[PDB]
Amino acid sequence: GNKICQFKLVLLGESLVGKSSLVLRFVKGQFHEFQESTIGAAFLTQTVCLDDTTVKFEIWDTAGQERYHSLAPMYYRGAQAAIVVYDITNEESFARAKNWVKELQRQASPNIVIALSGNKADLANKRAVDFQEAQSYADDNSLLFMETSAKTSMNVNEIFMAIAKKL
Numbered sequence: 001g002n003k004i005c006q007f008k009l010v011l012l013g014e015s016l017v018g019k020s021s022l023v024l025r026f027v028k029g030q031f032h033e034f035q036e037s038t039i040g041a042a043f044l045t046q047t048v049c050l051d052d053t054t055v056k057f058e059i060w061d062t063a064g065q066e067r068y069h070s071l072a073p074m075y076y077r078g079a080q081a082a083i084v085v086y087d088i089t090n091e092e093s094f095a096r097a098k099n100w101v102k103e104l105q106r107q108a109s110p111n112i113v114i115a116l117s118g119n120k121a122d123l124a125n126k127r128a129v130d131f132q133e134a135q136s137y138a139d140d141n142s143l144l145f146m147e148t149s150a151k152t153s154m155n156v157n158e159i160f161m162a163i164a165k166k167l
């Protein structure tokens with residue numbers, strides 16, 4: 001197909017849940033066991049083929065540490081989609097993700113497409129967040145949910161493509 005679409009996507013979530021790893025996996029096909037905490041935000045782009053449309057993602061990978069919270073609107077204002085990420089081995093990171101969802105629903109664009117990534121799914125032997133519980137939470141709040149693993153690549157391209165399809 002010859003159609004071309006471009007959308008702005010932002011990743012939000014508690015520090016260490018794997019936002020930069022998810023983006024690096026999707027954009028560069030890389031995964032680093034040792035990834036330094038992001039300062040402010042990082043920016044990357046990736047273009048994919050969806051049906052007869054070429055979709056380019058402009059991705060803002062935000063730093064999740066609390067000291068950067070006040071910068072968040074600079075990154076999510078104007079975003080057409082967001083991926084809120086938590087770590088399936090850490091319930092507090094899941095609670096933090098719910099508060100990011102609330103902030104987006106109240107302060108971001110009214111028509112933003114919000115996805116929820118239960119990341120580090122490869123560490124299911126240390127699970128702290130029940131899959132069905134997270135799926136129900138996502139369903140009830142109109143969020144596109146998938147468990148992902150930036151480490152193994154599980155559902156990484158899938159979550160970005162599912163978002164593209166809904167934009």
Ligand SMILES: Nc1nc2c(ncn2[C@@H]2O[C@H](COP(=O)(O)OP(=O)(O)NP(=O)(O)O)[C@@H](O)[C@H]2O)c(=O)[nH]1
Nearest residue numbers: 016017018019020021033037038064120149150151
């Ligand atoms: N097992 C596993 N480790 C992962 C996964 N995704 C990220 N990690 C690891 O978790 C750590 C932090 O990842 P990183 O992507 O930097 O997290 P972040 O959410 O960007 N942190 P910040 O918000 O501070 O920038 C790294 O050691 C990374 O290798 C995953 O899917 N599985």
Ligand SMILES: [Mg+2]
Nearest residue numbers: 019020037038
């Ligand atoms: Mg990061």
